[PDB]
Amino acid sequence: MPTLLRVYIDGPHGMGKTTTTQLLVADIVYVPEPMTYWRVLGASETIANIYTTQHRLDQGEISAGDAAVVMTSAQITMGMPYAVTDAVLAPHIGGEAGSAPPPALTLIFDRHPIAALLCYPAARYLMGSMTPQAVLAFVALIPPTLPGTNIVLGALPEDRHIDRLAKRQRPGERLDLAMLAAIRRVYGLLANTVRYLQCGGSWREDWGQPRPHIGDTLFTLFRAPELLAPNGDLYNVFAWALDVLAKRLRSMHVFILDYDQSPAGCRDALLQLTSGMVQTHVTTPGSIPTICDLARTFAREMGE
Amino acid sequence: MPTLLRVYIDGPHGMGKTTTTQLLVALDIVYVPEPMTYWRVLGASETIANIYTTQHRLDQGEISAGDAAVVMTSAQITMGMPYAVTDAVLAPHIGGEAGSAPPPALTLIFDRHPIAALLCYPAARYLMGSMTPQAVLAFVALIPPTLPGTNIVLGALPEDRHIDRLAKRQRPGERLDLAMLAAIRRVYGLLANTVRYLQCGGSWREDWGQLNAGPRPHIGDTLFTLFRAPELLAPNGDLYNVFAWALDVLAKRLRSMHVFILDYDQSPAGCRDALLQLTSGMVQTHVTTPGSIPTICDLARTFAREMGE
Ligand SMILES: O=c1[nH]c(=O)n([C@H]2C[C@H](O)[C@@H](CO)O2)cc1/C=C/Br
Ligand SMILES: O=c1[nH]c(=O)n([C@H]2C[C@H](O)[C@@H](CO)O2)cc1/C=C/Br
């Protein structure tokens, strides 16, 4: 069976992810952000909706709970194209290519399902607009990590990123620096959690508070009072959700892209990170054509 | 190599599903209750009361269509949470199908299945106007992979006996809405058909234009018919590719399930016995370790203790 190489460009927004990633593509397909689904298809102006709710809450115009139903609902719309894409792609993915020949196909996904199912929801809770239980519901629904999941997260100084973000302002966005901090922190903890997990870290054994300290992983976010029994013990439901987060993240292949550089530079770098990524076999002869079409139809229909 | 028997009893509420689940376990077996405590306090405060109140305000016209959808969707996420985590932890303990084959080492009787929270109630709420079809399809896209030996028992009870039954008991927060009752009844009815249609070779794509335990049903009698929504249709008339991909998943998820029908129009013990009879010819699965049984047993035990009653 021929091999496929899937790469998921992810990280905080405003770092130049999309720009540099189309820049290297345009055997290689680029799956963009489902902007059309966000703005029109699934609902109208989801982005605007998200940034507006926060602001009304920020300004005391709504309660933390109103911001939460809207926020939760919006996050459902946000990752819908990602959930179906993973779901349909899942059967075609086989085991890792002996890592391997040039892959018969390279998919450049602009973000992975975890952004909408884990990262953004976490950021919003850190922003006071999502319940830690809603977040934990998103985690529980995270699809099993298919082999060959290479996530490229980005690295960029804060003030440089604020400069860059001043422009990557999706339709109806608000330059919220606290959200930028929250999301940077969330993607930071995540890079740390993957390592902690890959280095043998056990959240249940470390809960009591080489490899990162549990206090520097996503597990810290869930020491939320809402998640605890009157005796301080995490409820089992929530603990089982942390077990899921743990097995979904431990098999993901993480790579870092320093965005503090020129477009051709960021782009070159990304082409560099490619040599250590895990590729896989497709399950059928028709997998490559069918995957290629999938990717081209997503772009065509939802890219904006 | 031990074998496990999983049985999810599902269907519209108010049919007596839980008494009969419990009676059956009173006759080894382990019962996994509805996570009423998660819905009342752990995940959110009075989630069921919220659902019935939100639809009401929508109905009364106090809240607006989208105001309700935003509440219904968040309420549906909370309702399904315990179901989705329990499924995710179970998954790696489930091995190949064995059949019903000798007595299983462990028998798990679940009150409802993940699709109740991620498909049925949401599809029912869509029909009630309190949810959008895009969102229902969003949930559908997140329906976890169907593990082998996924035996689902749906109930059958006459519309009238059901209404009376509903009319007698009292859920906390629930409100007698026979419009939702009919909605939930039709939805579980399309589900039953859907499984059979898929198991009879149907391809919703082949038959989209047309919109065993019996013959193959007409696509219009399956759940695919709820998605002929204008908002899911492109200008050219067909469904946008996102939504059609969601329906492919729905097909994949339900075609490997083993669905059974239990008639609830009999005494509690009658139902107890009718279900004990369907159970005999239900597909078992091996576990992935002898020690998966103890584990599985305890997971079920803790779930009950923590979220039941
Ligand atoms: O879950 C999400 N939620 C969210 O708030 N965003 C924001 C970031 C930026 O404002 C704009 C474009 O990424 O939308 C992205 C996603 C991505 C999901 Br895949
Ligand atoms: O998704 C759901 N949503 C919903 O409205 N309910 C209602 C039914 C009844 O009124 C009450 C108890 O099941 O809650 C059940 C479920 C259970 C899903 Br698992």
How would you characterize the overall build of this protein?
Chain A: It catalyses: thymidine + ATP = dTMP + ADP + H(+). Chain A: Keywords: ATP-binding, DNA synthesis, Early protein, Kinase, Nucleotide-binding, Transferase. Chain A: Belongs to the herpesviridae thymidine kinase family. Chain A: InterPro entries: Herpes_TK (IPR001889), P-loop_NTPase (IPR027417). Two copies of one chain form a homodimer. The first copy, chain A, is an alpha/beta fold and about 300 residues long. Chain A has one domain (about 1-305): Rossmann fold (3-Layer(aba) Sandwich). Chain A is built from 13 helices and seven strands. In chain A, helix 7 crosses helix 11 (about 235-250). The first copy, chain A, starts with a strand and ends with a helix.
